[PDB]
Structure formats: structure tokens, C-alpha cells
UniProtKB/Swiss-Prot annotation:
Involved in coproporphyrin-dependent heme b biosynthesis. Catalyzes the insertion of ferrous iron into coproporphyrin III to form Fe-coproporphyrin III. GO terms for molecular function: ferrochelatase activity; metal ion binding. Its EC number is 4.99.1.9. This is Coproporphyrin III ferrochelatase. Pathway: Porphyrin-containing compound metabolism; protoheme biosynthesis. Its main location: cytoplasm. Monomer. It is found in: Cytoplasm. It comes from Listeria monocytogenes serovar 1/2a (strain ATCC BAA-679 / EGD-e). Fe-coproporphyrin III binds at Y10, T12, R27, R43, Y44, S51, Y122. GO terms for biological process: heme biosynthetic process.
Length: 309
């Protein structure tokens, strides 16, 4: 019998006409203003029109399914994609499993770190849909940044970039490790998210030749409350002011694909800052559907399945 593999991600507009309803969904059903829509649409336009996140997420979910099924024959996995803010929604994926007769599923979020605003909400929605339908039972993975192959993947990508920096400028190079920002109040309740990112930065740093590093956040939202900082743009300016770094290497390790928050918030907004101070910009390829990353996810899911049984 088959075990459902519920692969969850944020979602992205398929078409330009979808941007309004996607943004409305992000804002809990409250339609943004015309100025807010125009600004978002202009960011998608700046990165080429739309984001490739849709096809990357699919390649990741079906590449993971194939890696799992080609590596063993104790069980057959069947992947279902459930998205947070556009169809197929999380609830649609759970419905489809139930209608297919899946009785047992493992879920994974395509974000390696846990927080109350991200993975918690994914898991709450998946379990609430399964409770109503009467199945499947969902066994959730909460985080997986500690996976050794995950850390080694990012260190290899950073070391390949650093090898193309001149040896006499490596001492003036800094590795900026980042994730999506969240409201700062999550620290008041000891949410694990900021600690998990610091841990990820520490594990990577001990495996790369780059001698300096700093932790930052990015892509904070339009609210009137404080968000986790420093922002990667502001941190770049500060570090140039104190240390005069010549090379900035940005690894937004909270993300797993090349989407709007990397293509715009790093490759446009951070490059604007490195240009202003006169430093070089580097941003290694994201994991996307590269086989080494599919192997990270296969290890994570197969270890989860091994520990249930
Ligand atoms: C955490 C976290 C992740 C990583 C975990 C996971 O991937 O789900 C995360 C991942 C992503 C990814 C990719 C994308 C890119 C989608 C694509 O079109 O390329 C992506 C894109 C957007 N996020 Fe995002 N996120 N995000 C928040 C937290 C997280 N976010 C919070 C909080 C709010 C604030 C909600 C509100 O305003 O009340 C919020 C709002 C937006 C908007 C709305 C427009 C704007 O104002 O910027 C867009 C577009
Ligand atoms: Ca921003």
C-alpha cells in the first residue's frame, strides 16, 4: 500500500492576473490597496514577469518522490503538493489523498527551519483538513536544517564561490546568512526560528574557507510592528562601514529555490548596496531540484519513515 508524501510550499502566481488574489490570500482575505498591488506586480516584472517557483516546487516534489521510490522497496511513496496561498491548497492535497485511499502520510515543508508563522501554520491546516475528512493520519516533519547533507550542500556551494575570489581578498570576504524575516515578537515566546538560523550559520561557517560571517534577515512585510533584524541591505552597509569588506557572499539558507525573495530581495536589492559601497556581489545557486538537494530531502523523509515504524 502507498504512503502519501505531502510536500508543502508557499505558492506563487501562475499568471499575472493571479497576483491580486494571491496577495489577498497572503493578507488573510483582506484585499490590498491598488498601490500595494502595483508594487508587487512591479517586483515580479523586474525579475522577468513571473517567478519560477511553481515549476521548481513541482520538480522538487516529484524529484523527491522518485528518489524515495528508486532507493528502496519497503514502501511506495506518492507525492501530493499542498500550497499555502494558491491552489492546490494544503486542504486540496489532503482531500486528494483521502479520495485516493491514502491512509498514512508524511509531510515536509520546503523550508528547513521551524517557526510559529511558517511550519506551525502548514501543519495546523494539514491536520485540520485530515481531521474533518477522517484521514489520512499525517506525521509531520517540523524542521530539517540539522541534516548533515543539507549543511554540506551549502558549504560546498560557498567554497566553490570563494575559490574564484583572489587569495589576497579572501580576508576581506564575508558570508551573509539569511532567512525570511518574521515579526520580532516571536522572540518574546522563545520561538525556535532565530536560534535555528544562527545554528545553521554556525554549522556552515565551520565548513567554509570564508573567514568572516554575519546573520541577517530579509523580505519583511508591510506592518507597523518591529520585524527580525538586521535586514540584509542594512547589514551590508554596516559591515562595509566597520570592516570595508570587498566581497559579500549571500546565502539565503532559509529558502530552497530561486523565487521572488531571492531574485528581487537579494539579486536586486543587495546588489544595489554592494554597488554603492564598491564591493562585489556573490549569490551561489539555490538548491532548486539539483540531485544533491533531492538526496538531502530523501534522507530526511526516509529517516522520518524509519522512526515511525
Ligand atoms: C517565514 C516565511 C517564508 C519561508 C517559509 C515558507 O517558504 O513558507 C516565506 C516564503 C516566501 C516565498 C518563497 C515567497 C515568493 C513567492 C513567489 O511569488 O516567488 C514569498 C513572497 C511573499 N511573502 Fe513571504 N514568501 N511572508 C511572510 C513570511 C514568510 N514568507 C510574512 C510573515 C508575510 C506578511 C503577511 C501580511 O502582510 O500580513 C509575508 C508576505 C509575503 C508577500 C506579500 C507582499 C509584500 O508585502 O511583500 C509576498 C509576495
Ligand atoms: Ca523587501
Amino acid at each position: 500500500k502507498k504512503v502519501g508524501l505531502l510536500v508543502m510550499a508557499y505558492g506563487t502566481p501562475y499568471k499575472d492576473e493571479d497576483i491580486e488574489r494571491y496577495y489577498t490570500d497572503i493578507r488573510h482575505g483582506h484585499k490590498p490597496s491598488e498601490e500595494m498591488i502595483a508594487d508587487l506586480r512591479g517586483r515580479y516584472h523586474a525579475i522577468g514577469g513571473l517567478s519560477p517557483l511553481a515549476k521548481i516546487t513541482e520538480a522538487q516534489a516529484y524529484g523527491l518522490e522518485k528518489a524515495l521510490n528508486d532507493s528502496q522497496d519497503e514502501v511506495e511513496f506518492k507525492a501530493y503538493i499542498g500550497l499555502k496561498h494558491i491552489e492546490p491548497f494544503i486542504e486540496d492535497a489532503v482531500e486528494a489523498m483521502h479520495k485516493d485511499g491514502i491512509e498514512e502520510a508524511i509531510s515536509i515543508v520546503l523550508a528547513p527551519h521551524y517557526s510559529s508563522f511558517s511550519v506551525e501554520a502548514y501543519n495546523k491546516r494539514a491536520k485540520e483538513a485530515a481531521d474533518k475528512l477522517g484521514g489520512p493520519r499525517i506525521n509531520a516533519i517540523n524542521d530539517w536544517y540539522k541534516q548533515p547533507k543539507f549543511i554540506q550542500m551549502w558549504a560546498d556551494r560557498i567554497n566553490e564561490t570563494a575559490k574564484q575570489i583572489p587569495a589576497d581578498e579572501l580576508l576581506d570576504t564575508v558570508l551573509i546568512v539569511s532567512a525570511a524575516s518574521l515579526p520580532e515578537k516571536i522572540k518574546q515566546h522563545n520561538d525556535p526560528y532565530p536560534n535555528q538560523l544562527q545554528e545553521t550559520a554556525d554549522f556552515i561557517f565551520e565548513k567554509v574557507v570564508v573567514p568572516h560571517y554575519a546573520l541577517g534577515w530579509q523580505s519583511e512585510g508591510k506592518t507597523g510592528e518591529p520585524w527580525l533584524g538586521p535586514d540584509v541591505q542594512d547589514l551590508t552597509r554596516e559591515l562595509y562601514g566597520r570592516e570595508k569588506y570587498k566581497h559579500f557572499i549571500y546565502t539565503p539558507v532559509g529558502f530552497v529555490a530561486e523565487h521572488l525573495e531571492v531574485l528581487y530581495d537579494n539579486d536586486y536589492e543587495c546588489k544595489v548596496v554592494t554597488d554603492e559601497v564598491g564591493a562585489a556581489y556573490h549569490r551561489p545557486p539555490m538548491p532548486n531540484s539539483d540531485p544533491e538537494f533531492l538526496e538531502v530531502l530523501r534522507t530526511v523523509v526516509w529517516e522520518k519513515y524509519s522512526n515511525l515504524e
